[PDB]
Each structure stands twice: as structure tokens, then as C-alpha cells.
Amino acid sequence: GRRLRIGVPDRASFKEFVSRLDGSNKVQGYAIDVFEAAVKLISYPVPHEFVLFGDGLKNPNFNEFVNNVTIGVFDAVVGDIAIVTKRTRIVDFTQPYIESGLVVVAPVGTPIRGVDTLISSSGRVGFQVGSYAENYMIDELNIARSRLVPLGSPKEYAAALQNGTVAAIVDERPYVDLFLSEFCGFAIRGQEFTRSGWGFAFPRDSPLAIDMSTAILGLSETGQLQKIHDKWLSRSNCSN
Ligand code: NA
């Protein structure tokens, strides 16, 4: 019956997903709304307190964040957390509450067609600081570490692409959709080349990971999950 210590990423950018409210110790955003809606559908109480994770200067390392459940600093983590295979070895995720996977974004009229263009070329590649994309590109795709440039925010994405400091950026589709809604002149090249959605994570063998999956499914089936997306993530200033 004790309050679960739930870690939440202290996002410096793309704060619509989850962030600190107005520099308080309170939190808000898309993932928080999904979690609180889901908890209402759980058949037993889930007392909890949210605990911000990160330096407040840059988006946190999501691998390190999830590891804080494994080592017991957090009882759970709630946020925009990609369900990637290495993390599933050390926590139990819910079923995903939103689709996500890595895509390539570049200037309109780029010759880049997708991640296979990057693998066979020399240009620098941007990624979001703290994203699994960094490890994915180095490890799975064997892209030279020297080519990778960490970027902090959608303004930095537009600047790096415009000034040619990177040829393209690799990041998960939800961040790229928010970027393309704010900054005109860029486009996704190719399909997703990973398919890990976002989920909440609990300790290995936690019953709450399974109970929360049924609750998330309930939200999907009633249309509440779509309405929460609409609340946080539907604004766009871009056609093309
Ligand atoms: Na920005």
C-alpha cells in the first residue's frame, strides 16, 4: 500500500510528451495523461508519486532512466519510453500505448532516400540526445560514431539541417512529427526502420505491467487514448 516512486523524464524539449509543469515538482503531458487515465481502470489502488529524472539541461538518457527501475531507485517509469529489446531484458513494459519507430528526416529535395542512403554515405547524422537511436546506429547499423551529432530540440534540428552541419537526422516518428509541425522545409525519407512503440516500465515479473496493458487497451477501445493524443499532439503549421 506504499506510494510507488514513478520516474518521469525531465524533458528539455518536445515537452508535449511529458515535462515538469512551470518549473514546479509537478508534471504534465501526453504520457502523464495516458498513465493517469489507465490507473483509473486498474481494479486496485496504485498510490504513486512522480520523481523527475534528468539534469534539467538536456533530455535524459532513456537507457539510464529505465535502469533506475532495475536498481530500485524507481518502482516504475512513465514517459515516452521506447520498448527496445535490450530494455525488455531488465524491466517489464506494458503493451505500447503509441506506435513509434526510427525514421530519417532531411531537407526537402535531399537525395537521401532512407537509412540505407545514410549507411552507404559519409555525411554527418543528427540524433536526439539520450535516444536509443544513438546506440542503434552505432551497434546495429555500424554507422561510424564520428558521424553522429547530438541535438537537443526541434529548433536545433532545423538549424543543423539548414546549415549542413548534418545531412539528416534519425529519430523516432513522434518527435519528427512534432518537428515537421513546427519547422517547414523538411521531410521524412523512407519508412520506419524500427517498430518499438512507447510503454511504461515496471520491474521484471511485475503484475502491474500486465494489468496496465489491459487498462491501456481499455483506453484504446473507448477512444480515450486517441482523445489524449488529440489534446497534446495535433497542432501543425505545415502542409507539404
Ligand atoms: Na526547439
Full DSSP string of the chain: -PPEEEEEE--SS-TTSSEESTTSS-EESHHHHHHHHHHHHSSS---EEEEEES-SSS---HHHHHHHHHTTS-SEEEEEEE--HHHHTTSEEPSPSB---EEEEEETT-S--SHHHHHTS-S-EEEETT-THHHHHHHTS---GGGEEEE-SHHHHHHHHHTTS-SEEEEEHHHHHHHHHH--SEEEESS-S----EEEEE-TT-HHHHHHHHHHHHHHHHTHHHHHHHHHH---S---
**Protein fold of 4-98+196-233:** D-Maltodextrin-Binding Protein; domain 2 (3.40.190)
Whether the domain at 4-98+196-233 and the domain at 102-189 fall into the same CATH topology: yes
Q: In this structure, are strands 27-28 and 4-9 parallel, antiparallel, or unpaired?
A: unpaired
**Protein fold of 102-189:** D-Maltodextrin-Binding Protein; domain 2 (3.40.190)
Residue 57 Cα, ligand 1 centroid: separation in angstroms?
13
Number of CB atoms found within 10 A of residue 217's CB: 16
Whether 201 contacts 92, CB under 8 Å: yes
Query: Nearest-CA neighbor of 187 among 239, 234, 235, 142?
Result: 239
d(CA 67, CA 48): 19
Query: Nearest-CA neighbor of 175 among 88, 78, 104, 76?
Result: 104
Residue 156 Cα, ligand 1 centroid: separation in angstroms?
6
Listed in sequence order, the residues at least 6 apart from 179 whose beta carbon sits closer than 8 Å to its beta carbon are 105, 154, 157, 158, 171, 186
CA of residue 46 relative to chain centroid, distance: 24
Whether 68 contacts 77, CB under 8 Å: yes
Residue 104 Cα, ligand 1 centroid: separation in angstroms?
18
Method by which the model was determined: X-ray
Whether 149 contacts 129, CB under 8 Å: no
Whether 46 contacts 4, CB under 8 Å: yes
d(CA 45, CA 42): 7
| Residue 174 marked ligand-binding | yes
Residue 158 Cα, ligand 1 centroid: separation in angstroms?
9
C-alpha cell at 98: 503509441
User: Which residues keep their CB under 5 angstroms from ion ligand 1?
Assistant: 153-155
| Residue 96 marked ligand-binding | no
Residue 109 Cα, ligand 1 centroid: separation in angstroms?
23
DSSP result, 49-97: EEEEES-SSS---HHHHHHHHHTTS-SEEEEEEE--HHHHTTSEEPSPS
| Residue 81 marked ligand-binding | yes
- For this entry, resolution in Å reads 1.6
User: Domain boundaries in the chain?
Assistant: 4-98+196-233, 102-189
Number of CB atoms found within 10 A of residue 141's CB: 16
Q: In this structure, are strands 125-128 and 148-151 parallel, antiparallel, or unpaired?
A: parallel
Per the DSSP assignment, residues forming a β-bridge with 126 are 149, 169
Number of CB atoms found within 10 A of residue 124's CB: 17
CA-to-CA dists, residue 98 to 20, 21, 136, 200, 225, angstroms: 21, 22, 20, 11, 9
| Residue 175 marked ligand-binding | yes
